[PDB]
Coordinates of C-alpha atoms in Angstrom, one line a residue:
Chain A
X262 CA 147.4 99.8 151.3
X263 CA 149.4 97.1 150.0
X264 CA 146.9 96.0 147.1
X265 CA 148.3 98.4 144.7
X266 CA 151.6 97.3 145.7
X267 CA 150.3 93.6 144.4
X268 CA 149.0 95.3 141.3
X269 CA 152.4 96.7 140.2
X270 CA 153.8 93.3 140.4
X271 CA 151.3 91.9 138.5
X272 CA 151.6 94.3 135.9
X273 CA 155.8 93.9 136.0
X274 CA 154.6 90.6 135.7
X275 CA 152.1 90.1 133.5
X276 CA 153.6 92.7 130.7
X277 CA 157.3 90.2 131.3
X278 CA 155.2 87.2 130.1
X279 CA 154.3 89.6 127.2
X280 CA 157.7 91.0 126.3
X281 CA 158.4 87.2 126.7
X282 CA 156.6 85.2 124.4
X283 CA 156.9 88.4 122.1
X284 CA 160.8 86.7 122.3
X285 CA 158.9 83.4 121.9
X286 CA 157.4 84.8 118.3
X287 CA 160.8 86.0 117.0
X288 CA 162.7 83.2 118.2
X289 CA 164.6 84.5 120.2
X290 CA 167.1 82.9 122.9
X291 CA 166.0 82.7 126.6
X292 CA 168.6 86.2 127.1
X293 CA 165.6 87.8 124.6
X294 CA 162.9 86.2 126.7
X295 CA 164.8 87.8 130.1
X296 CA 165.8 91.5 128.8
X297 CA 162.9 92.2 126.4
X298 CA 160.5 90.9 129.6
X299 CA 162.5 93.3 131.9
X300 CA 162.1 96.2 129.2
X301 CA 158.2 95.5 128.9
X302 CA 157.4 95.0 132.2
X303 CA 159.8 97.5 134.2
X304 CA 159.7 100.6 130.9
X305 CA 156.4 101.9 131.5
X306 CA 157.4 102.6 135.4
X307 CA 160.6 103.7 134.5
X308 CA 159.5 106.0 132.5
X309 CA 157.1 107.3 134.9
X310 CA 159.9 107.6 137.7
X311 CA 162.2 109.1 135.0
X312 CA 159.7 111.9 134.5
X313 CA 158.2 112.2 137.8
X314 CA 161.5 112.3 139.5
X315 CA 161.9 109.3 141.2
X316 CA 165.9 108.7 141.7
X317 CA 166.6 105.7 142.0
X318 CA 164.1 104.2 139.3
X319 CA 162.0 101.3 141.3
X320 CA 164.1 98.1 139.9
X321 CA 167.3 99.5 140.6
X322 CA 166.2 100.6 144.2
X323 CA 165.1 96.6 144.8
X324 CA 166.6 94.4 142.6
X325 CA 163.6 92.1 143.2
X326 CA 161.4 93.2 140.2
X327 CA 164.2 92.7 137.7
X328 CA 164.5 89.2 139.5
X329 CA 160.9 88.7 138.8
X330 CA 161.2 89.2 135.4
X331 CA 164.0 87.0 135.1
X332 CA 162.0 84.5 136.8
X333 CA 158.9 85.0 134.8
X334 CA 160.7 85.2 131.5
X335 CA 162.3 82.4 132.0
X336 CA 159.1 80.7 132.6
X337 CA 157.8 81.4 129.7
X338 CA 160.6 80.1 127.9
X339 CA 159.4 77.0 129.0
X340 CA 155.7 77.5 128.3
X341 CA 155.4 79.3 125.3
X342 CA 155.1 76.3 123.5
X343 CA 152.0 75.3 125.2
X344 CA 149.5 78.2 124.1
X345 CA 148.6 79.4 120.9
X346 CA 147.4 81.7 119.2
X347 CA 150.0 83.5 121.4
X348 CA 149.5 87.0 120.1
X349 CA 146.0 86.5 121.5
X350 CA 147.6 86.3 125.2
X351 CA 149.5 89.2 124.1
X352 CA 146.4 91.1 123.9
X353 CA 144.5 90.1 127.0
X354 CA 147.7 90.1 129.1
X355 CA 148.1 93.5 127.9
X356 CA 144.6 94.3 128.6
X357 CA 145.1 93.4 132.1
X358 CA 148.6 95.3 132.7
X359 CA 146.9 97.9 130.8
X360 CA 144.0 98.6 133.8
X361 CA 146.3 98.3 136.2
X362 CA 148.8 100.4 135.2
X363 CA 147.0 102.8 133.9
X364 CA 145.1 103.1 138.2
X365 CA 148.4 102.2 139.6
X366 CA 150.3 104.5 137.8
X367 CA 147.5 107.5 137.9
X368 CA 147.9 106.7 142.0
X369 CA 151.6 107.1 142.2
X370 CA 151.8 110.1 139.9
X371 CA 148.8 111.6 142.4
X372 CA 150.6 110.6 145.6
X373 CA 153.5 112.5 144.2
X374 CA 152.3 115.9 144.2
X375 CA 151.6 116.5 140.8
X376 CA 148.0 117.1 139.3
X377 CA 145.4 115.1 138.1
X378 CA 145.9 115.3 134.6
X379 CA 149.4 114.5 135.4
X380 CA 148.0 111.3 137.3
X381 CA 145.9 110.8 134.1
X382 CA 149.0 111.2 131.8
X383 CA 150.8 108.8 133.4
X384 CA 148.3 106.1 134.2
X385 CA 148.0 106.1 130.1
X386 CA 152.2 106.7 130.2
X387 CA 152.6 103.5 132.1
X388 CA 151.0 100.9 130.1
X389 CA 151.2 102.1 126.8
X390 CA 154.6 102.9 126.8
X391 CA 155.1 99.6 129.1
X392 CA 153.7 98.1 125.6
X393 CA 155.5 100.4 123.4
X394 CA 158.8 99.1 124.5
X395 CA 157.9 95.7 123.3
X396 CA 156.1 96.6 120.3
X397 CA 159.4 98.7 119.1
X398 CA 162.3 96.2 120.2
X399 CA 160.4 93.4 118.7
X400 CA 160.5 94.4 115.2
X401 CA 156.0 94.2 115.0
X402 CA 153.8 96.9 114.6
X403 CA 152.5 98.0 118.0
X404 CA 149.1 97.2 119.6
X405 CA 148.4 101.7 119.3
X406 CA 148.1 101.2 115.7
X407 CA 145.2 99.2 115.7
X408 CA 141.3 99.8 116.4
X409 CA 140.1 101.2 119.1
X410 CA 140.6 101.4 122.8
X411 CA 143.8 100.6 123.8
X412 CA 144.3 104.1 124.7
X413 CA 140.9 105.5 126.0
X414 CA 140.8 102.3 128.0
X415 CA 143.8 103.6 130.2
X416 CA 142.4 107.2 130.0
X417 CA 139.2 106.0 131.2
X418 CA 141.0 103.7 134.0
X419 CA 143.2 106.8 135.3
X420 CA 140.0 109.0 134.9
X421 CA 137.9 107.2 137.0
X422 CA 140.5 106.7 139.4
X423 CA 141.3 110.4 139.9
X424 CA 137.4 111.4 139.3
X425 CA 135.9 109.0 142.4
X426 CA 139.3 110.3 144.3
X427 CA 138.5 114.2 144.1
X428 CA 135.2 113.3 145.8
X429 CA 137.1 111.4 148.3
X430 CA 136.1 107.8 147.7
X431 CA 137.3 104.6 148.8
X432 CA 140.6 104.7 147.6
X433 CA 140.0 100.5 147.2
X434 CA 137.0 101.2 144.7
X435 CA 138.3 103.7 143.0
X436 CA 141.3 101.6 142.1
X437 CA 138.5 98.9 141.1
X438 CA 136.4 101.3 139.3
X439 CA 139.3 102.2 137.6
X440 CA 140.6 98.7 136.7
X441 CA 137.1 97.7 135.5
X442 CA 136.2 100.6 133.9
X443 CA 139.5 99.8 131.8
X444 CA 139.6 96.0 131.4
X445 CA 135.9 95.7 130.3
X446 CA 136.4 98.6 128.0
X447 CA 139.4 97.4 126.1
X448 CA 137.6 93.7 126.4
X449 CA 134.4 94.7 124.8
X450 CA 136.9 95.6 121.7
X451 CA 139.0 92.6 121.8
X452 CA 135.6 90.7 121.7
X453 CA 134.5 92.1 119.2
X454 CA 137.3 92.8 116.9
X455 CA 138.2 89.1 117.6
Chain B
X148 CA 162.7 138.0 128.1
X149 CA 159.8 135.9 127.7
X150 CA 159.9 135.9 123.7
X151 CA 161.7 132.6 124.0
X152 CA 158.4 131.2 126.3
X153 CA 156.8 131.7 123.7
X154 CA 159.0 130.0 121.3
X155 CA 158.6 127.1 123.3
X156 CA 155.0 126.8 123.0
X157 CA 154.6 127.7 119.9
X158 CA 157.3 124.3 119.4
X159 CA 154.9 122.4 122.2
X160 CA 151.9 123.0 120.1
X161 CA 153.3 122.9 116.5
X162 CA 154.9 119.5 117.1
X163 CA 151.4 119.1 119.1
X164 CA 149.2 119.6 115.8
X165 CA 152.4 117.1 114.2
X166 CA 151.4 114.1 116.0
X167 CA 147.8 114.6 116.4
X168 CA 147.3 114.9 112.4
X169 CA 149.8 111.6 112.3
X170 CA 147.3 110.2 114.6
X171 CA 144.8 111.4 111.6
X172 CA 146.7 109.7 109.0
X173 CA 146.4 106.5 110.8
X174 CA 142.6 106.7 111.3
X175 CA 143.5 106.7 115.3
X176 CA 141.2 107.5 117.9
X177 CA 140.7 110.9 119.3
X178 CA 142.7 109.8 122.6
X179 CA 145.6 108.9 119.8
X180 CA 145.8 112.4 118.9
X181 CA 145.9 113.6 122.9
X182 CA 148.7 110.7 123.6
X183 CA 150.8 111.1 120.6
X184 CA 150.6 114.7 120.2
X185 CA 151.7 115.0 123.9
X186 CA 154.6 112.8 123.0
X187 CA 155.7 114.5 120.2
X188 CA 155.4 118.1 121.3
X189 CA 156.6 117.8 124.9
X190 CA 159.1 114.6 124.0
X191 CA 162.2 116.7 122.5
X192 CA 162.5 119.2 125.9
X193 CA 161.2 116.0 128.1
X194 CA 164.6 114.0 126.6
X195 CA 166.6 117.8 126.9
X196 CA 165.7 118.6 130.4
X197 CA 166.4 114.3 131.1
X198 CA 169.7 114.8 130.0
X199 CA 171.0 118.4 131.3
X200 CA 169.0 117.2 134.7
X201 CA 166.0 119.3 135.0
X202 CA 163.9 118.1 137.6
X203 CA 161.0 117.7 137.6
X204 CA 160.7 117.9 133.7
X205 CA 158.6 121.0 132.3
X206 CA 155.4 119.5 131.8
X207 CA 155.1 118.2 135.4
X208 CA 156.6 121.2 137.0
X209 CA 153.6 122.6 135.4
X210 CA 150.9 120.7 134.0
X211 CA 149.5 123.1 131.4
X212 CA 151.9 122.2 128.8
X213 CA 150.3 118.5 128.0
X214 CA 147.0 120.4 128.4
X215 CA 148.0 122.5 125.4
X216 CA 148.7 119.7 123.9
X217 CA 145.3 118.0 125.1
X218 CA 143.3 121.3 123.6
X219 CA 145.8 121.3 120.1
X220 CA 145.9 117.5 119.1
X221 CA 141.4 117.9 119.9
X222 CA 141.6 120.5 117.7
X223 CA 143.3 119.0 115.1
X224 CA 140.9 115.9 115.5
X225 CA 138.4 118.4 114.4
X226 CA 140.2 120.0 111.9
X227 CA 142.4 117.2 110.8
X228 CA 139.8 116.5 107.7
X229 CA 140.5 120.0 106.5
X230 CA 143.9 120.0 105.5
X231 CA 144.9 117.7 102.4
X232 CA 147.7 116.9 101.6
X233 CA 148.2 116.6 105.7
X234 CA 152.1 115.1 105.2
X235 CA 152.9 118.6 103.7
X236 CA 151.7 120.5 107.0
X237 CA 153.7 118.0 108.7
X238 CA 156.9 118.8 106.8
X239 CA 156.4 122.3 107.1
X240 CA 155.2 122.8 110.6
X241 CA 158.1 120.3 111.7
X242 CA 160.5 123.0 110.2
X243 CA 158.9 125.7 112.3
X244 CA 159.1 123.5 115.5
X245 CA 162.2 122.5 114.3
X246 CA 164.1 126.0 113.9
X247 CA 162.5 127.3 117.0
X248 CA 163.3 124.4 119.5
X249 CA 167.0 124.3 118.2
X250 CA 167.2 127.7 119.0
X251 CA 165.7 128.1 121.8
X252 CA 167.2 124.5 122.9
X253 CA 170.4 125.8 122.5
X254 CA 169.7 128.9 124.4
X255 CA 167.9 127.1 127.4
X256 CA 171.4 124.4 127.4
X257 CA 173.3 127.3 127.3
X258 CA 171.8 129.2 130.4
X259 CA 172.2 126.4 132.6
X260 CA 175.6 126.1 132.4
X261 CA 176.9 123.4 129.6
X262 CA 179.5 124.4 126.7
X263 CA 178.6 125.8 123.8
X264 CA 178.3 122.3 121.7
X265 CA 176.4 120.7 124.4
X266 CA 173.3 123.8 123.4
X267 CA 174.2 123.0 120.0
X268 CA 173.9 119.6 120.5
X269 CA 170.2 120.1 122.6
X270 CA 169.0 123.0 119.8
X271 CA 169.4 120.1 117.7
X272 CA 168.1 117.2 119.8
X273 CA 165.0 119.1 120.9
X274 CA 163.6 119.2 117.7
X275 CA 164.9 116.3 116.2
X276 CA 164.0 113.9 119.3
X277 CA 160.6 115.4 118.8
X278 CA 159.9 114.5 115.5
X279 CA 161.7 111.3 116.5
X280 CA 159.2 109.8 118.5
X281 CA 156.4 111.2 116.4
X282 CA 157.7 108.7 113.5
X283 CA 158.6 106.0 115.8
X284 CA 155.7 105.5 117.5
X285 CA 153.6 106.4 114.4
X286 CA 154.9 102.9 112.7
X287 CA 156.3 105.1 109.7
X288 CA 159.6 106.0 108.4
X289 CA 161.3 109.5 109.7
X290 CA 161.9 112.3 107.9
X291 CA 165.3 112.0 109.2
X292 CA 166.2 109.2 106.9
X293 CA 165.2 111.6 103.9
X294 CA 167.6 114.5 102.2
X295 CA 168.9 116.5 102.9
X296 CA 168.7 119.2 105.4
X297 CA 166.6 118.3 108.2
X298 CA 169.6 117.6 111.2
X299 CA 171.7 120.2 109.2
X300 CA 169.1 123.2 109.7
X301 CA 168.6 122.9 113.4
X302 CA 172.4 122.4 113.2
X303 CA 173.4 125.5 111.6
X304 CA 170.3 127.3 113.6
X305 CA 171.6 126.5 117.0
X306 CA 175.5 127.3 116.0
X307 CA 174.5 130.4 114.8
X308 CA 172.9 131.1 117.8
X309 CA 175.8 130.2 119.8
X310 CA 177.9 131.8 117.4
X311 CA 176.1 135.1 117.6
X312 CA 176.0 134.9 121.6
X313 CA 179.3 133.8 121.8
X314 CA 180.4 137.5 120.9
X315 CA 177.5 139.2 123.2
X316 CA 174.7 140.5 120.4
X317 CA 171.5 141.2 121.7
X318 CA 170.5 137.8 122.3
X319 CA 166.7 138.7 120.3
X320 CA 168.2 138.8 117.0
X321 CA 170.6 135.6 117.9
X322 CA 167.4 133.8 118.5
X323 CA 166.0 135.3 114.8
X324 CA 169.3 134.7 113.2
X325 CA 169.1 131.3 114.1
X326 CA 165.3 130.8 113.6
X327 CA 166.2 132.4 110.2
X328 CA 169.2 130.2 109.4
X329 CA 167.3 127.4 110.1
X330 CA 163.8 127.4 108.7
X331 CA 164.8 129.1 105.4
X332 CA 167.5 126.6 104.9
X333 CA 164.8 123.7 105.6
X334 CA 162.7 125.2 103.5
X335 CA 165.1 125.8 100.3
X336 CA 164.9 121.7 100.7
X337 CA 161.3 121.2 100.8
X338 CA 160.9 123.5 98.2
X339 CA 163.2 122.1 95.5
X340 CA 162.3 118.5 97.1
X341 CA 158.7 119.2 96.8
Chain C
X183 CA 192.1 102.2 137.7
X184 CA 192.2 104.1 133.9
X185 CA 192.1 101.1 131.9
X186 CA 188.1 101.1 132.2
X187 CA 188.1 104.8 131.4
X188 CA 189.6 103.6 128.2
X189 CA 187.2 100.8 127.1
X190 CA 184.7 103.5 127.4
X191 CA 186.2 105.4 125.2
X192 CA 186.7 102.7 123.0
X193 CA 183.1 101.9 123.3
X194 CA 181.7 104.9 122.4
X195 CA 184.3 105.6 119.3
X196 CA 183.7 102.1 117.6
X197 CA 179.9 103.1 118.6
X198 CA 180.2 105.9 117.0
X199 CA 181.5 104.4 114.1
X200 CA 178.8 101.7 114.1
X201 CA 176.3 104.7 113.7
X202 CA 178.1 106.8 111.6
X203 CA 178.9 104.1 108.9
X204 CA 174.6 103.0 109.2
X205 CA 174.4 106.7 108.3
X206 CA 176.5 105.9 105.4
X207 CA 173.9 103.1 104.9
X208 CA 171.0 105.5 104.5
X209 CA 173.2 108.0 102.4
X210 CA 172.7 110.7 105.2
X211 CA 174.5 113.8 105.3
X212 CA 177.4 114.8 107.5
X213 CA 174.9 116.0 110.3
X214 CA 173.3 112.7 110.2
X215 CA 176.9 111.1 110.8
X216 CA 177.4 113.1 114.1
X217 CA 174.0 113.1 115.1
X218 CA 173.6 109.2 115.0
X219 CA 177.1 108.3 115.8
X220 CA 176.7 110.5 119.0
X221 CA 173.3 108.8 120.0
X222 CA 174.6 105.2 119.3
X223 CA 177.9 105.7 121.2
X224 CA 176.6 107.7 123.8
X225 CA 173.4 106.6 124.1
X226 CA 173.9 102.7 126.2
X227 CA 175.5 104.9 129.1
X228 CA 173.5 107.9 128.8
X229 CA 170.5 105.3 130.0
X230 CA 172.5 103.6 132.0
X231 CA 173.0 106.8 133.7
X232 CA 169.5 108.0 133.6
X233 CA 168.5 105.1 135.3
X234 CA 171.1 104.8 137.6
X235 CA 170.2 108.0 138.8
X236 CA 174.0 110.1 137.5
X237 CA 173.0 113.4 137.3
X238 CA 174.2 115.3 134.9
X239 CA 174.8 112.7 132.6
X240 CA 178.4 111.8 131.1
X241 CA 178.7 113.8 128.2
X242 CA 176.9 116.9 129.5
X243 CA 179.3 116.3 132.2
X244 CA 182.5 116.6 130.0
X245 CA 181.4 117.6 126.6
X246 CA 184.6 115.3 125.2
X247 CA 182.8 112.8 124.7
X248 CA 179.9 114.2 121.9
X249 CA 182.9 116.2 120.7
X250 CA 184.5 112.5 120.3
X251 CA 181.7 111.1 118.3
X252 CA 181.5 114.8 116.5
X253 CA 185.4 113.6 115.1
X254 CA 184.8 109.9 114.8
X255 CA 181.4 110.3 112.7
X256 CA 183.5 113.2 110.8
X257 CA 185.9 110.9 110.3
X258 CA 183.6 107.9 109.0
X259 CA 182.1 110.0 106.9
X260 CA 185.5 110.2 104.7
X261 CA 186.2 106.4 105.0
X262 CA 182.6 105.8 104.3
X263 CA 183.0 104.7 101.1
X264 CA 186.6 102.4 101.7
X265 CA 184.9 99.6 103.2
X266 CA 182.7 97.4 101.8
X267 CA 180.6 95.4 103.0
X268 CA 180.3 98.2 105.7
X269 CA 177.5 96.2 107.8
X270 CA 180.2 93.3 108.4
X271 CA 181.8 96.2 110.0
X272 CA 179.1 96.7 111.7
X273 CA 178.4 93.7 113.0
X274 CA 182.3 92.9 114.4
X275 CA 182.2 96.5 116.1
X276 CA 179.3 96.2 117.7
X277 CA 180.6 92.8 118.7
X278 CA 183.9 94.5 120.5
X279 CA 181.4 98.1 121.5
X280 CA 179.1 94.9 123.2
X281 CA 182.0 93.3 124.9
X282 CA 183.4 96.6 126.8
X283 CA 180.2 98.3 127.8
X284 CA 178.9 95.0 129.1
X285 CA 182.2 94.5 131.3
X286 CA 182.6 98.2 132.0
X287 CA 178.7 98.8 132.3
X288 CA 178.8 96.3 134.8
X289 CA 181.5 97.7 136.9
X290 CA 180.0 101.1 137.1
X291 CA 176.9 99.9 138.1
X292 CA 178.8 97.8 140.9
X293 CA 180.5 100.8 142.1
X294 CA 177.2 102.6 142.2
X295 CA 176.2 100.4 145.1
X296 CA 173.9 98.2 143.3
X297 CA 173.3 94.4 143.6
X298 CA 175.0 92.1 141.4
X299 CA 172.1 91.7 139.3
X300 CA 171.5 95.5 138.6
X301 CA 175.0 95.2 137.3
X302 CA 174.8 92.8 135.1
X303 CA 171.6 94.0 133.3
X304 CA 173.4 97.3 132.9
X305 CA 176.2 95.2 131.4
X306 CA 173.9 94.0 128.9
X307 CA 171.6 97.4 129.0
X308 CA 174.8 100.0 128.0
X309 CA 175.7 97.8 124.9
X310 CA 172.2 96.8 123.4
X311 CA 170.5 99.8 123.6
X312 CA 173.8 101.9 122.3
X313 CA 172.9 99.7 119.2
X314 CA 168.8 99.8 119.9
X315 CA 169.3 103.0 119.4
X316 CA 171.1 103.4 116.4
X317 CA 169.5 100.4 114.7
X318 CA 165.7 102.0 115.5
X319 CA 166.8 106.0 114.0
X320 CA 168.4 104.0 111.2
X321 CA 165.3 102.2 109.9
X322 CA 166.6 98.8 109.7
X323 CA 166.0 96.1 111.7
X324 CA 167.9 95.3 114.9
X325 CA 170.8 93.0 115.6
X326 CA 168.9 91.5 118.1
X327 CA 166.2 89.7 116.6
X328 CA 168.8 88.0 114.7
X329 CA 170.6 84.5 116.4
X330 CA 172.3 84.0 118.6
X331 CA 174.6 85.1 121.0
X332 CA 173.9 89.0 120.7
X333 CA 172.5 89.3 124.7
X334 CA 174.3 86.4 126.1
X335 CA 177.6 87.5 125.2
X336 CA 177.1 90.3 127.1
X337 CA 175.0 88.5 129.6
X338 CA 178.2 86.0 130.0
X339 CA 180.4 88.9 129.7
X340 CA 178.9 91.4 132.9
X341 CA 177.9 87.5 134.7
X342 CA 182.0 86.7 134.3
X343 CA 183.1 89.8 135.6
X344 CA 180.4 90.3 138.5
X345 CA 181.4 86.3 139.3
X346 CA 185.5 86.8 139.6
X347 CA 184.6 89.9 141.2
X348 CA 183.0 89.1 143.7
X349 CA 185.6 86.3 144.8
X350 CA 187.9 89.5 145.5
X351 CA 190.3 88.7 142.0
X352 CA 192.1 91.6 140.3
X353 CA 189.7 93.9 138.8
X354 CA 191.5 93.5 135.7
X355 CA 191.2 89.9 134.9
X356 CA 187.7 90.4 135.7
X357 CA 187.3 93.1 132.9
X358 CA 189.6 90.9 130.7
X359 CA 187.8 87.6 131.2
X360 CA 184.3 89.5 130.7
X361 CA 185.7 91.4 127.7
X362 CA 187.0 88.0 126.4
X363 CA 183.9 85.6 127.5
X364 CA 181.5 88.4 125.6
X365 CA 184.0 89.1 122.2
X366 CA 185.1 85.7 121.4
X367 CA 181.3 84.3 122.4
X368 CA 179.8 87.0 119.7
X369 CA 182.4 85.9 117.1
X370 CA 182.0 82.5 117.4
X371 CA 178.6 82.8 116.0
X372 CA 179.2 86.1 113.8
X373 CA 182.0 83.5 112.0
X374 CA 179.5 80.3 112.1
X375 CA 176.7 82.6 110.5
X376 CA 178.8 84.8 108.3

């Protein structure tokens, strides 16, 4: 499998456009729009390696997904001019990182060793905290605070993932069960609270 | 001795019932109360065992820990309407975790092989770190920031208990003597304070 | 090479200060002055460490360093009260703290046998999160939302050294010209806005 591998770089991605244009609301210099993109989109994996155990922590093992954030960061020094309401991206973008971290993440912490609830835990551990970052560093209240699935949308990802991989599933659909079963979730919410 | 297990879960779901009824004063959702109360009453030994190098951390080593948490913060969810006012129980039950993780913080940084004011130091950090990301992630300010006692307590509580194992006392009444010297000092505070 | 051993030092005194004398800010106690100071001045290499995968970490390592903090918050706690403004101080220390942990944060990560890169974000990572965290426990707002040099002196600072470094210069220039090329860059602005 190599999708889940493509998933993870979208969510480094994706969550370094977020920590980006964050930067882009405060401000801040393109050295903002780089670190505070490699905090948002690297933290919530670091933190999952940091607890898991993983030495050394995936960006310092290959450079590359700092690089990407650097890259992506940068980008969106350049184009977060073009789209507003930006805080709306914010939330979609972290919709998306959201469901796949949260199947990502609940597959790594499974592959490990550890239990399922442990593979739950950290599906929810790797997006919300991958948001947290942000949210704190920025200086704005985080996304947690608010109404009223940011949360059970990552539990129900990681959930879904583990439940259809105890019966021995497609891993494939389970990681698309889990993704959907997150993204629509926390959409149905961001549709109708918007 | 497995007095000092219990300690530690009594700390795990104190801190637990902390961040879930935080999660209650900001109206979050039950999955809030899971997430948060996890984070608050497994964060201070999560950052303790980080730091001295325990790997893997305690709750992944064995899984049952968040699941306390995951059966405490439900509880509270239930029970969260019960209790008013519910900042009080938070003051008060974050003295209890408070004088029980310093101590047995200290003593748990002490067996592994560090210096005296390095178990000092982790008495102290387990409890404070604790409430620390409680109030951090909560979005309100931390009790840290308000007089007088709160660092000094788990201070005096894990320096005591050094102090009283430094001269080789039965290490029980070390762990009371410093569970003593702490929580009643905290509470002299939030007794004149409140 | 014991130069670099010093600027570490250096860094996590004046840190220690930086915390210490924010403690004086929020009219904490004494406990609150060793307590902060230690997790401002320690803190940038404890995660730089963490990351990095050093295990155990510096000051568990050699309990100097806390006990360092322990007498420099101590010691701020007296001479609280002689400066005024004390955030001025503040700022100018965390200027010089910034300057050394990025060179120095950036040569320990080098020697680790990291890329380039890795080095340079932990040139940046050691100094702004030793204020992050500080700046978050305190309550007030962050130095780095503010403009404008705050990451790319740092960024120019670990970028310098990693650059004359890897041409094979003396060390020493390297650490000068990245201590100089982060300092004088941070006052440049901290004297155009102040």
């Amino acid at each position: 499998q190599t999708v889940t591998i493509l998933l993870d770089w979208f969510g480094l991605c994706i969550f370094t456009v977020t920590g980006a244009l964050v930067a882009s609301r405060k401000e801040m210099d393109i050295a903002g729009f780089v670190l505070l993109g490699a905090v948002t989109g690297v933290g919530g994996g670091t933190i999952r390696d940091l607890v898991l155990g993983r030495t050394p922590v995936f960006w310092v093992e290959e450079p590359a997904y700092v690089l990407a954030c650097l890259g992506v960061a940068v980008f969106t020094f350049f184009f977060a001019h073009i789209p507003q309401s930006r805080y709306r991206f914010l939330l979609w973008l972290d919709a998306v990182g959201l469901s796949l971290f949260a199947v990502t993440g609940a597959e790594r912490a499974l592959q490990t060793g550890a239990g399922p609830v442990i593979a739950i835990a950290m599906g929810v551990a790797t997006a919300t905290f991958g948001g947290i970052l942000r949210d704190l560093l920025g200086g704005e209240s985080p996304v947690i605070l608010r109404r009223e699935i940011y949360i059970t949308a990552a539990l129900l990802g990681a959930a879904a993932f583990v439940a259809l991989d105890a019966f021995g599933a497609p891993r494939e659909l389970a990681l698309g069960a889990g993704f959907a079963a997150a993204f629509l979730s926390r959409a149905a919410g961001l549709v109708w609270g918007l």
